[PDB]
Design an enzyme around this catalytic site. Structure first.
Site, mmCIF file in Angstrom:
data_model
loop_
_atom_site.group_PDB
_atom_site.id
_atom_site.type_symbol
_atom_site.label_atom_id
_atom_site.label_comp_id
_atom_site.label_asym_id
_atom_site.label_seq_id
_atom_site.Cartn_x
_atom_site.Cartn_y
_atom_site.Cartn_z
ATOM 1 N N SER A 117 41.467 -1.594 -23.515
ATOM 2 C CA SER A 117 40.697 -0.585 -24.248
ATOM 3 C C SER A 117 41.232 0.803 -23.912
ATOM 4 O O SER A 117 42.438 1.045 -24.102
ATOM 5 C CB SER A 117 39.209 -0.832 -23.995
ATOM 6 O OG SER A 117 38.433 -0.102 -24.924
ATOM 7 N N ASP A 234 36.357 -7.021 -33.353
ATOM 8 C CA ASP A 234 36.238 -5.959 -32.360
ATOM 9 C C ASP A 234 35.683 -4.718 -33.049
ATOM 10 O O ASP A 234 36.345 -4.128 -33.910
ATOM 11 C CB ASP A 234 37.626 -5.694 -31.782
ATOM 12 C CG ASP A 234 37.605 -4.761 -30.589
ATOM 13 O OD1 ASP A 234 36.682 -3.913 -30.495
ATOM 14 O OD2 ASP A 234 38.531 -4.871 -29.750
ATOM 15 N N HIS A 264 35.224 -7.442 -28.246
ATOM 16 C CA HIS A 264 36.147 -6.489 -27.641
ATOM 17 C C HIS A 264 36.711 -6.973 -26.305
ATOM 18 O O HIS A 264 37.919 -6.858 -26.055
ATOM 19 C CB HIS A 264 35.412 -5.160 -27.456
ATOM 20 C CG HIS A 264 36.254 -4.053 -26.902
ATOM 21 N ND1 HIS A 264 37.477 -3.699 -27.429
ATOM 22 C CD2 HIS A 264 36.018 -3.185 -25.887
ATOM 23 C CE1 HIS A 264 37.971 -2.679 -26.747
ATOM 24 N NE2 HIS A 264 37.096 -2.338 -25.815
HETATM 25 C C1 LIG Z 1 26.686 1.295 -39.934
HETATM 26 C C2 LIG Z 1 26.614 1.954 -38.585
HETATM 27 C C3 LIG Z 1 25.778 2.960 -38.180
HETATM 28 C C4 LIG Z 1 26.090 3.289 -36.858
HETATM 29 C C5 LIG Z 1 25.440 4.327 -35.994
HETATM 30 N N1 LIG Z 1 27.107 2.510 -36.427
HETATM 31 C C6 LIG Z 1 27.447 1.661 -37.475
HETATM 32 C C7 LIG Z 1 28.443 0.732 -37.309
HETATM 33 C C8 LIG Z 1 29.157 0.602 -36.104
HETATM 34 C C9 LIG Z 1 30.162 -0.265 -35.717
HETATM 35 C C10 LIG Z 1 30.470 0.026 -34.399
HETATM 36 C C11 LIG Z 1 29.657 1.064 -33.999
HETATM 37 C C12 LIG Z 1 29.572 1.732 -32.662
HETATM 38 C C13 LIG Z 1 30.560 1.205 -31.654
HETATM 39 C C14 LIG Z 1 30.472 1.955 -30.350
HETATM 40 O O1 LIG Z 1 29.734 1.579 -29.447
HETATM 41 N N2 LIG Z 1 31.229 3.045 -30.255
HETATM 42 C C15 LIG Z 1 31.247 3.875 -29.061
HETATM 43 C C16 LIG Z 1 31.966 5.171 -29.293
HETATM 44 O O2 LIG Z 1 33.363 4.866 -29.419
HETATM 45 C C17 LIG Z 1 34.228 5.918 -29.547
HETATM 46 C C18 LIG Z 1 33.819 7.242 -29.571
HETATM 47 C C19 LIG Z 1 34.765 8.246 -29.691
HETATM 48 C C20 LIG Z 1 36.102 7.932 -29.787
HETATM 49 C C21 LIG Z 1 36.509 6.608 -29.763
HETATM 50 C C22 LIG Z 1 35.581 5.578 -29.640
HETATM 51 C C23 LIG Z 1 36.030 4.140 -29.544
HETATM 52 C C24 LIG Z 1 36.407 3.751 -28.110
HETATM 53 C C25 LIG Z 1 36.851 2.302 -27.799
HETATM 54 C C26 LIG Z 1 36.141 2.499 -26.446
HETATM 55 C C27 LIG Z 1 35.236 3.546 -27.120
HETATM 56 C C28 LIG Z 1 35.551 1.288 -25.690
HETATM 57 N N3 LIG Z 1 36.135 1.827 -24.458
HETATM 58 C C29 LIG Z 1 36.642 1.227 -23.349
HETATM 59 O O3 LIG Z 1 37.597 1.689 -22.750
HETATM 60 N N4 LIG Z 1 36.043 0.086 -22.947
HETATM 61 C C30 LIG Z 1 36.199 -0.490 -21.608
HETATM 62 C C31 LIG Z 1 34.927 -1.335 -21.876
HETATM 63 C C32 LIG Z 1 33.753 -1.130 -20.907
HETATM 64 O O4 LIG Z 1 33.638 -2.364 -20.154
HETATM 65 C C33 LIG Z 1 34.419 -3.312 -20.732
HETATM 66 O O5 LIG Z 1 34.484 -4.433 -20.282
HETATM 67 N N5 LIG Z 1 35.092 -2.784 -21.763
HETATM 68 C C34 LIG Z 1 34.799 -0.633 -23.249
HETATM 69 C C35 LIG Z 1 36.918 2.849 -25.156
HETATM 70 N N6 LIG Z 1 28.860 1.426 -35.033
HETATM 71 B B1 LIG Z 1 27.801 2.555 -35.046
HETATM 72 F F1 LIG Z 1 28.424 3.781 -34.878
HETATM 73 F F2 LIG Z 1 26.875 2.361 -34.029
#
Ligand SMILES: CC1=CC(C)=[N+]2C1=Cc1ccc(CCC(=O)NCCOc3ccccc3CC3CC4(C3)CN(C(=O)N3CC5(COC(=O)N5)C3)C4)n1[B-]2(F)F
Length: 290
Positions: A117, A234, A264
Site C-alpha cells: 500500500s 481493492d 486490499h
Molecule cells: C459512494 C461512496 C461514498 C463515500 C464516502 N465513499 C464511497 C465509496 C468508496 C469506496 C472506497 C471508499 C473509501 C476508501 C477509504 O477508506 N479511503 C481512505 C482514504 O484514502 C486515501 C485518501 C487520500 C489519498 C489516497 C487515499 C488512498 C490510500 C490507499 C491507502 C489510503 C491505504 N493505505 C495504506 O498504506 N494501508 C496500509 C493498510 C493499513 O493496515 C493494513 O494492513 N493496510 C492500509 C494507503 N469510499 B468512500 F469514500 F467512503
C-alpha cells in the site's frame, strides 16, 4: 529523561535509528542463524506499523534472508506527530538510510524491498532512486492509483487546505471493512493500539496524492525486478494502478498476480489468498536469491 517512544518506552531499550531530521525510528530485525543470502527491507503502509509483518518476515528469514524494517515517521513506535509527514520523500529518504546502513554491515549481499500500500509506493520510489542497485521488489497492493472516491474526496478537500491555513482539517479514516474479507483480520486491525485509526488529516492525504504523482513520474526510471500482487476488489488502491505499473515500468522482470474478489490486505486476507500470497513471495524471492 531519555527519549521515549510515543508509548513511553526508552529508545535506549529498543532497536532504533535516528533519521536526518533527528527523529528516532523504531527498528525490527529477523536474521537467520546461518549466513544470510540476501537482505530484505519491509515497508509498512499508512496507519499501521512494522509489527504487522511478523509472519511474512519469519517466512523470509526461513529462506535465510535477513529481514529488516522500521516504523515510518509518525507511525507505530517511531517518533513524529501521528500520521503527519513534512513531505512524502521523508519516508523514502529514511528507507534509504536504513538500507545503506545495513548494506555496510552485510556487504556483498543483494537487497530486496517489500512494501504494501503506502509502503509499496515508498518501495517504488526507493528503487527508482537507485536504478540497478536492488535485486527485486515485492509489492502487495501498492499505492499506484488511489481508490477514485478517496482521490476525489481529498482532491476537493486539498483545495481548501492548499489555499487556506487549515492545518488540522481531517476527512474520514481509512475504512477497516474494506481492508480484508477476513473478519478476524479486520477485528485485529481495529484492536491494535499501535495502529492509528483516526480520520485522515487532509495534509497527510495530500502527501498520499504526492506519492501517486511521484510514482507516475518514477515508472520510466523503474527497472528493478518486481512481483506485483493485487486484489480485484481493492477499494483502497485501485487495481487499475497495478495494471498501469505493469504497463509503464521499464523493468524486464515483472509479474502480476490478480486475486479475484480479494480486498486490499492480501497477506491478511481469506486463508486461500494469504496462503497463496506467502507461497508466491517465497518462490519469487527464492528464485532471485539463488
Ligand atoms: C459512494 C461512496 C461514498 C463515500 C464516502 N465513499 C464511497 C465509496 C468508496 C469506496 C472506497 C471508499 C473509501 C476508501 C477509504 O477508506 N479511503 C481512505 C482514504 O484514502 C486515501 C485518501 C487520500 C489519498 C489516497 C487515499 C488512498 C490510500 C490507499 C491507502 C489510503 C491505504 N493505505 C495504506 O498504506 N494501508 C496500509 C493498510 C493499513 O493496515 C493494513 O494492513 N493496510 C492500509 C494507503 N469510499 B468512500 F469514500 F467512503
Amino acid at each position: 529523561s531519555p527519549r521515549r517512544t510515543p508509548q513511553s518506552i526508552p529508545y535506549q531499550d529498543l532497536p532504533h535509528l535516528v533519521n536526518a531530521d533527528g527523529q528516532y525510528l523504531f527498528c525490527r530485525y529477523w536474521a537467520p542463524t546461518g549466513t544470510p543470502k540476501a537482505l530484505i527491507f519491509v515497508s509498512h503502509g499508512a496507519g499501521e506499523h512494522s509489527g504487522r509483518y511478523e509472519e511474512l518476515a519469519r517466512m523470509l528469514m526461513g529462506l535465510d534472508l535477513l529481514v529488516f524494517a522500521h516504523d515510518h515517521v509518525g507511525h507505530g513506535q517511531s517518533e513524529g506527530e501521528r500520521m503527519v509527514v513534512s513531505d512524502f520523500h521523508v519516508f523514502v529518504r529514511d528507507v534509504l538510510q536504513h538500507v545503506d546502513s545495513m548494506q555496510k554491515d552485510y556487504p556483498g549481499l543483494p537487497v530486496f524491498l517489500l512494501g504494501h500500500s503506502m509502503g509499496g509506493a515508498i518501495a517504488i520510489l526507493t528503487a527508482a532512486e537507485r536504478p540497478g542497485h536492488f535485486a527485486g521488489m515485492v509489492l502487495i497492493s501498492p499505492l499506484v492509483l488511489a481508490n477514485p472516491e478517496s482521490a476525489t474526496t481529498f482532491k476537493v478537500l486539498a483545495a481548501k487546505v492548499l489555499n487556506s491555513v487549515l492545518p488540522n482539517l481531517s476527512s474520514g479514516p481509512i475504512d477497516s471493512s474494506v481492508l480484508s474479507r477476513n473478519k478476524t483480520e479486520v477485528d485485529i486491525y481495529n484492536s491494535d493500539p499501535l495502529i492509528c485509526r483516526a480520520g485522515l488529516k487532509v495534509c497527510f492525504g495530500i502527501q498520499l496524492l504526492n506519492a501517486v504523482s511521484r510514482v507516475e513520474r518514477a515508472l520510466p526510471k523503474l527497472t528493478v525486478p518486481f512481483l506485483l500482487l493485487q486484489g480485484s476488489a481493492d477499494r483502497l488502491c485501485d487495481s487499475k494502478g497495478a495494471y498501469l505499473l505493469m504497463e509503464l515500468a521499464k523493468s524486464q522482470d515483472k509479474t502480476l498476480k490478480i486475486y479475484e474478489g480479494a480486498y486490499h490486505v492480501l497477506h491478511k486476507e481469506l486463508p486461500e489468498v494469504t496462503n497463496s500470497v506467502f507461497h508466491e513471495i517465497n518462490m519469487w524471492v527464492s528464485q532471485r536469491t539463488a
